Amino acid sequence: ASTDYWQNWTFGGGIVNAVNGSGGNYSVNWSNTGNFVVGKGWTTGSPFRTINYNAGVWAPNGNGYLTLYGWTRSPLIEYYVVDSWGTYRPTGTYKGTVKSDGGTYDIYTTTTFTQYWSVRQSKRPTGSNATITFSNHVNAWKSHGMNLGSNWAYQVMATEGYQSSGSSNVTVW
């Protein structure tokens, strides 16, 4: 599918070199300081979307996430489906598990507004075509009282980095 949206949010200092490539491809190399969220995706998110991606490079040196990222309004909720990370596996209040796309994910909430997380139990292999069947996560979240808002905002396959260095190259469709 044609992604129709590119986002770079960079907070604080240091280097965050994000490149908005042709079609669904992007790259980032970083060395900060702060925090960033970079990704390609869709302007209106859907609980039904299947995200295809291929992480040609996934090389965080420290704290970084390779993750579906998006939010809803009414109410405002941020959500993540984390397929890989660096030196820190993100966690929160444990809610349950979901099996999807050949992996098992732990379900967490963090905190004011709430964030919803699915975090793969081990790092997903990268370099081959991968799918995130978002509906599996959405339905699992519902079963643990984690319901998304009614007004859907953007939805991206993102690289997030926090006070670290690294490189990623990701193609999204």
**Catalytic residue ranges:** 78, 160
Give the type of residue at 139: N
Stretch that binds a second copy, among 7-15, 57-65, 131-139, 157-165 (CB under 8 A): 7-15
Binding to a second copy (CB under 8 A) within 45-74 occurs at: 73-74
- Cβ contact 162:27 at 8 Å: no
163 binds a second copy (CB under 8 A): no
Q: What are phi and psi of 43, to 5 degrees?
A: -70, -35
> Which uninterrupted H or E stretch holds 126?
none
CB of 162 to a second copy, least distance (A): 15
129 binds a second copy (CB under 8 A): no
Judged on CB neighbours under 10 Å (0-12, 13-18, 19+), 45 is buried
CA 93 to chain centre: 18
CB of 9 to a second copy, least distance (A): 6
111 binds a second copy (CB under 8 A): no
Give the torsion through C-alpha atoms of 60, 100, 80, 127, to 10 deg. 30
The tokens for 82 are: 């984390």
156 binds a second copy (CB under 8 A): no
CB of 13 to a second copy, least distance (A): 8
11 binds a second copy (CB under 8 A): yes
20 binds a second copy (CB under 8 A): yes
16 binds a second copy (CB under 8 A): yes
Put residue 61 in one of left, alpha, beta given phi > 0 → left and psi -120 to 50 → alpha: alpha
Stretch that binds a second copy, among 15-23, 59-67, 77-85, 124-132 (CB under 8 A): 15-23
4 binds a second copy (CB under 8 A): yes
Put residue 103 in one of left, alpha, beta given phi > 0 → left and psi -120 to 50 → alpha: beta
| Site of interaction with a second copy (CB under 8 A) | 2, 4-13, 16-18, 20, 34, 43-44, 73-74, 150-152
